[PDB]
Amino acid sequence: ANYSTNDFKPGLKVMLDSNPCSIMENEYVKPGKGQAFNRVKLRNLKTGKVLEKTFKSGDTLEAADIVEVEMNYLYNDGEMWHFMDPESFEQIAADKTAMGDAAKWLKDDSNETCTIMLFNGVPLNVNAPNFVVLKVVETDPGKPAKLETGAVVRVPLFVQQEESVRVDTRTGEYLERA
Ligand SMILES: [Cl-]
C-alpha cells in the first residue's frame, strides 16, 4: 500500500484512474523469454463495471481506503440513512446514492444489520440483509403488492393487506409468508 504486481490477489482494493477498484481475477503470465506480467480483472467499486488490464512487473498501484463494516440501521430522514455500530456505538450516515437499492428493504425501527462499504471513511455502498420481513400496505383482493417501505413486489393472490411477507433483497422477490 503502495502495491506491486506481486501483491495482486482476488479481492484486493486498489486505485485505478482515480477510482477505487477490487481485483476480481489475477493471472500470472511467464513469457519465454522476458518479464513476467499479470492480467487482472478489476471491478470498479463506484460504477460496478468490470475492467481488464495488463500490468508489467514493476508496475505499481496505490491502495484504496476501502473497508466493509457491519452496522445496525436506525432511521432515515428521506435524504440520509443513519446506522450505529453495535460494539463501537459510533454512528455513520449514508446518502441516497450510497444506499442505492438497500433503502427500499429497511423498515422503520427494524434494526437490521447492514453491510456498509466505506471509501475514505465515507459510505460508498450499502447492502441490506439477504432476507427481510416487511408488511404489505397496498394490495387488492400473482399480484402487485406495495410493502411498508414503498418497495413493490409480486405476491401470491392469497396475501392480503397488513399481512407480512419475507422478501429476498438480492432478487427483490417474495419468498414466503411471514
Ligand atoms: Cl409470488
Side-chain angles (χ1 to χ4, degrees), residues 1-8 10-16 18-27 29 31-32 34 36-45 47-48 50-52 54-55 57-61 63-78 80-86 88-89 91-153 155-176 178:
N2 262 16
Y3 294 121
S4 82
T5 58
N6 300 308
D7 295 322
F8 291 170
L12 196 68
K13 303 308 195 318
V14 303
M15 296 295 307
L16 190 55
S18 59
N19 293 327
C21 294
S22 189
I23 286 182
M24 292 169 87
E25 313 283 338
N26 179 31
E27 81 181 14
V29 185
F37 56 98
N38 297 78
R39 275 195 266 257
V40 55
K41 210 169 173 195
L42 298 98
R43 180 174 297 283
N44 179 326
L45 294 181
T47 295
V50 171
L51 277 173
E52 319 207 344
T54 297
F55 290 85
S57 273
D59 273 352
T60 189
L61 279 188
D65 189 29
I66 293 276
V67 61
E68 298 202 322
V69 196
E70 304 259 301
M71 276 186 268
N72 287 359
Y73 170 58
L74 298 166
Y75 73 91
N76 79 86
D77 60 17
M80 304 294 303
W81 276 249
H82 296 263
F83 304 78
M84 147 264 293
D85 188 308
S88 151
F89 272 82
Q91 293 183 55
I92 207 58
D95 57 37
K96 224 153 172 283
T97 302
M99 289 299 299
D101 206 77
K104 66 210 263 215
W105 307 120
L106 299 182
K107 166 176 43 189
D108 283 346
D109 279 295
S110 62
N111 231 78
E112 308 269 10
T113 299
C114 290
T115 300
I116 300 183
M117 181 167 103
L118 301 171
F119 177 39
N120 298 323
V122 177
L124 186 55
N125 298 310
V126 169
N127 292 277
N130 297 337
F131 301 99
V132 292
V133 163
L134 299 163
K135 183 169 80 191
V136 173
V137 160
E138 199 197 272
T139 197
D140 54 72
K143 57 179 183 180
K146 181 184 288 173
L147 311 183
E148 65 189 305
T149 62
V152 179
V153 296
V155 303
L157 303 170
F158 68 79
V159 176
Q160 297 302 327
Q161 305 198 163
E162 302 307 315
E163 208 161 332
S164 282
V165 296
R166 184 163 282 112
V167 185
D168 185 323
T169 66
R170 291 152 318 168
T171 64
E173 277 178 347
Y174 166 87
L175 178 66
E176 64 194 346

